[PDB]
Request: fold
Amino acid sequence: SQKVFGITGPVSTVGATAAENKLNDSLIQELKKEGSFETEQETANRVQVLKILQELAQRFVYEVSKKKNMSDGMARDAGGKIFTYGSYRLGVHGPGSDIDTLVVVPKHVTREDFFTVFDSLLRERKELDEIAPVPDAFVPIIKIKFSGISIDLICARLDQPQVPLSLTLSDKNLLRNLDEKDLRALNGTRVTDEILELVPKPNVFRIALRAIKLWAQRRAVYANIFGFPGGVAWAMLVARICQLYPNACSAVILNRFFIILSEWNWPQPVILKPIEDGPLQVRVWNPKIYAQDRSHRMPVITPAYPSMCATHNITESTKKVILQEFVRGVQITNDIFSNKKSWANLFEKNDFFFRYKFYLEITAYTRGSDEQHLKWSGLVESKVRLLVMKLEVLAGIKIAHPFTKPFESSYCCPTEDDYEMIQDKLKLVTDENKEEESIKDAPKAYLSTMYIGLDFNIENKKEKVDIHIPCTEFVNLCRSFNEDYGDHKVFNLALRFVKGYDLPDEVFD
Ligand SMILES: Nc1ncnc2c1ncn2[C@@H]1O[C@H](COP(=O)(O)OP(=O)(O)OP(=O)(O)O)C[C@H]1O
Ligand SMILES: Nc1ncnc2c1ncn2[C@@H]1O[C@H](CO)C[C@H]1O
Ligand SMILES: [Mn+2]
Ligand SMILES: [Mn+2]
Reply:
């Protein structure tokens, strides 16, 4: 329409040279080799599950409407519709990707109705492989497996009487009178919906995103919780570049992507359209008004009202890592165009555990249930980011690089002396002896381990600067959160300074 060229108009309208298309085809070839795509069959199986889910959404609404003494024609007209968002919505999902699904219902259909009626309607089916309703998440959701496909299901209820099949959620007004949770549920689809609408060629955009997703995950800079961009972040970033080069191939895009983003005058934010305004008393991203927004280091703003910063977590250290990976990209993709390097080069696994002379090892323990460790450790994990910030600001610390994948492991811990022992360094549970009588019964002890790469300023001081305060603190805050956490009988947290030379063998597996 015009907005497909971004807020600065394109950088160049030039088409792709025959040579550039050759490199683009080889790029897609590599992606295929990496099994990025799925088979026409598996795609067809997702279309089918969704088709059924739509059928169930209508049935859900219809049934609830009837119980409200509605006409046979009105219960039908009340409608009910299914929307997707996430990986599948953008068309960059993979063989094992789940399908994030939003269910929209009229005013008279409540969330309670959702976990009751809709749920029951799901169970009344053969294809239901399993259901894990978690009604109290930040965004109420019902997680299920259907016909061998994972489906995330959240429910949004609009302040209107009907939800027709034609309804699209672009209108800013659909948000009227909604509550925090419903409002939160609409945002996902509204955002992915706009991304696809602000890009010149959605197909060029998809291949380039698959590449960036792969790349980011291999270079260990794809994890929102640790201060790196998440999926939506990476997507908007690719789209901003697709905007700049309307008719280039995905290959030239990845190159311009790395160059521009590494030279970008951060914290100038990246946006796909002019930040809008509106009704709701809700805050919109605005660094002039809100301090919290003035501190975002690399802002990537969502286009759908109300605009938020998808990269809030980024710190000064992860910021450096990200620039570093961008630079390595300028260098490698420039080589791939000179015929001196290949795409596989670009997608090479990182070497986190080989690059620093020291590391901070954080381990969370749990002598209890699988749900207790998932909770405890899930807390520590989320807080690691705070430590990176306390750490990267002290004396002479050049960087505090948080790795992005904790190391999980549990042991059959029968005694008490066995617990207050496995955390001093006892049969390593395994996918082999997991459901075996003797094992499956045995009480367990879990532990999740995380690392922070450290680089001390090689200035010329007599000695490195002790990081005891920040560490002990991080411990405290992590315990001082719940009464159960500050126990010691079930939960434990330890931090050990480790030289690159003494890293655990499991870290290189
Ligand atoms: N902390 C969060 N707050 C709000 N929305 C979130 C948060 N974390 C994830 N999301 C939403 O969840 C959506 C689905 O993500 P998820 O299913 O985990 O992966 P995806 O991004 O769809 O990739 P795969 O499904 O892994 O290919 C995408 C995003 O809009
Ligand atoms: N704001 C949000 N909108 C939609 N889904 C969300 C969400 N926050 C979390 N989720 C769900 O949480 C999972 C990813 O963290 C899958 C995704 O559907
Ligand atoms: Mn998903
Ligand atoms: Mn999901």
About this structure: The CA atoms of residues 483 and 491 lie 11 Å apart. The chain is about 40% helix and 15% strand. The pocket of manganese (II) ion (ligand 3) is lined by residues 86-87, 97-98, 100 (CB under 6 Å). The longest strand covers residues 444-456.
